[PDB]
Amino acid sequence: EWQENKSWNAHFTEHKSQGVVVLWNENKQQGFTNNLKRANQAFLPASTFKIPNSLIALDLGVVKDEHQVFKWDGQTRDIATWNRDHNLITAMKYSVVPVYQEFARQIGEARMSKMLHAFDYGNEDISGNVDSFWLDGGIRISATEQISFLRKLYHNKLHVSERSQRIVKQAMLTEANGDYIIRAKTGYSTRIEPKIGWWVGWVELDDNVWFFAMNMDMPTSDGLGLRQAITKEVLKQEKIIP
Numbered sequence: 561e562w563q564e565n566k567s568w569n570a571h572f573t574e575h576k577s578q579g580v581v582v583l584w585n586e587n588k589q590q591g592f593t594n595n596l597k598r599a600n601q602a603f604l605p606a607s608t609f610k611i612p613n614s615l616i617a618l619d620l621g622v623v624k625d626e627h628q629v630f631k632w633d634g635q636t637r638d639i640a641t642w643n644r645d646h647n648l649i650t651a652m653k654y655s656v657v658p659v660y661q662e663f664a665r666q667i668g669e670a671r672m673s674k675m676l677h678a679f680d681y682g683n684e685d686i687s688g689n690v691d692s693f694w695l696d697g698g699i700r701i702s703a704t705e706q707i708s709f710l711r712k713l714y715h716n717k718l719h720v721s722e723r724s725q726r727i728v729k730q731a732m733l734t735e736a737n738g739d740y741i742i743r744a745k746t747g748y749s750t751r752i753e754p755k756i757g758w759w760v761g762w763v764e765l766d767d768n769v770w771f772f773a774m775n776m777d778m779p780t781s782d783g784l785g786l787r788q789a790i791t792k793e794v795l796k797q798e799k800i801i802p
């Protein structure tokens with residue numbers, strides 16, 4: 561069911577880094593990873609948490625639809641793309657933390673905790689501040705647990721409406737061409753050691769789906785582009801994409 565290929569470590573070590581990629585072949589119900597231990601180690605989700613947060617906000621009506629405009633609060637932040645209005649699509653695309661912090665305040669602790677438990681999401685622990693627990697609170701999730709959660713979303717099996725799941729999967733759209741579609745979300749965790757980058761999602765093909773979850777050490781922001789680059793290089797190696 562699970563196979564470890566330690567030769568894939570080269571994708572990380574050649575960049576003087578360390579990490580894990582986890583792949584799941586949906587048709588064959590088989591998983592692959594370079595590091596079984598790290599595949600099951602739980603890290604802060606950071607901005608990959610925008611997937612469940614979006615689902616919960618939509619299903620409770622905190623967010624009406626993917627067109628609703630969330631106005632900039634007028635506080636200048638150091639990420640230029642955050643200093644403007646957003647909807648759910650652009651907020652996901654540019655990982656706009658302060659929009660999602662307001663979602664969480666409106667969701668509230670009680671409803672947030674119940675929904676993460678319904679989702680079987682990570683350790684289901686929201687200890688910390690309700691507007692930042694996914695950045696520096698007690699919540700943790702592993703790469704294998706990310707895949708488990710994403711598969712439920714793909715099949716519309718999470719305990720929210722089908723509409724909420726279709727909208728979030730639209731907002732996860734990252735890349736599409738004549739060969740494949742990638743729906744995914746990046747993450748960057750810096751407030752608690754070890755600092756890591758995430759990329760989780762799936763690749764749609766004509767006749768199969770491949771789910772993926774990766775994290776890697778990220779001592780500086782200079783390596784963030786390696787999250788997608790390494791993942792796609794593994795996918796090309798395994799001939800999942802050309």
Ligand SMILES: CS(=O)(=O)c1cccc(-c2cccc(C(=O)O)c2)c1
Pocket residue numbers: 638639654655746748750781784
């Ligand atoms: C410490 S931070 O202000 O949260 C911070 C520092 C550097 C970068 C980012 C960031 C912002 C938006 C998108 C992405 C990204 O990796 O797609 C990354 C956030």
Ligand SMILES: [Cl-]
Pocket residue numbers: 729730733
């Ligand atoms: Cl779409």
